[PDB]
Amino acid sequence: EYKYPAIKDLKKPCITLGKAPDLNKAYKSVLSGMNAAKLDPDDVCSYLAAAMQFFEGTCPEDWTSYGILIARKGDRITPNSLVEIKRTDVEGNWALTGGMELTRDPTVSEHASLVGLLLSLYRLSKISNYKTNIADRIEQIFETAPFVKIVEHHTLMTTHKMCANWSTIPNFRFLAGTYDMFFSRIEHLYSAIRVGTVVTAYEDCSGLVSFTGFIKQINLTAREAILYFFHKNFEEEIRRMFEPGQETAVPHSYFIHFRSLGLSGKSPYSSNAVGHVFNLIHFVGCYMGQVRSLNATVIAACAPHEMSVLGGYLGEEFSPEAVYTRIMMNGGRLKRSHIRRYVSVSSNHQARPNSFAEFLNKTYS
Amino acid sequence: IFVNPSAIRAGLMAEETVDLINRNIEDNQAHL
């Protein structure tokens, strides 16, 4: 709930890293670590930031967000244009550890592959198995022209196993978000790098994303859909999500990557922050049989018992006055028909701990 | 507790937030 992301002072998102390395040496050190599963997170970030210079493209339209100009139509930019990287006097370590067959200097094509593989440790870390499906596909993308094979199959997963928590290293998360924001705006030769960074888009905005996804699914306008959220706790939640000045409607705004770029540590759009709304949406998904909703986590604090009642009636539709009428007429209680339906779905589902399906089984079965 | 939705008719860029967010998520699918 606490911190809205809108930059108030025209300052670009900023991080500080060590002293800029010679890029050929940095490549060699970092590839060596990738091969030995022994990566240094400060070195990786320093390298990732310095490699930004290789990803130049033309801005197709003016680009401004929170008063900050990033580029004008036609400017040549790199991801470095989106942020400020400060650097200290302190050299990184740059150890050679694993295999280094390469005497000569790396090509730009080789840098981009390594950048791509390093960033993909963000996505792999973000998943709490199916990692090997993801990892094998990623490895293949980065062996496929315009990328170059620089590592052996199964290297990425081995290294990931050692880097499983890198998605909460703030500098690495920052660099993933910056590369994702760049390639979202600039169609680029190396755009397939987003395979690793795409998950930064809308991080900590589950409540807002559920809400917008719900509007699409019931196939109504946003004005019409808000009328169905008629319980009194929804009012402050809906206000919270449409706070002005936040650029939720602005294409390519820093808003889209606010969490990863550190604009706020305390999202007002998360599932917790709009818990009543989130709970209702997913009880409606449960009533419809949607597996995404049955395996979501209930927001314990936000009257899930009451949200489940409203969700039955809303689930029964799918007029907002007609729904309100039925609920008052029934004294705010579910009908036996609603209960039969919720139980039919939940009781046939592989219910996870703290999930909506578990709640339904504990409550109504 | 439950407020009447004919009473809710009197209240104030949500439409295009909805439309932007859903479209960006639809494109992000290509990368996943």
Author numbering:
A (entry chain A): 27 to 154, 160 to 349, 401 to 447
B (entry chain B): 4 to 15, 20 to 39
Question: What are the paper's exact sentences on this?
Answer:
As for all non-segmented negative RNA viruses, rabies virus has its genome packaged in a linear assembly of nucleoprotein (N), named nucleocapsid. RABV N is composed of two globular domains that are connected by a hinge, creating an RNA binding groove. It also comprises two subdomains, an N-terminal extension, named the NNT-ARM, and an internal loop in the C-terminal domain, named the NCT-ARM, that dock to neighboring subunits in the polymeric form and thereby stabilize the assembled NC. Thus, genome replication requires the production of the unassembled RNA-free N protein, named N0, in the form a complex named the N0−P complex, in which P prevents the polymerization of N and the illegitimate assembly with cellular RNA until N is transferred to nascent viral RNA.
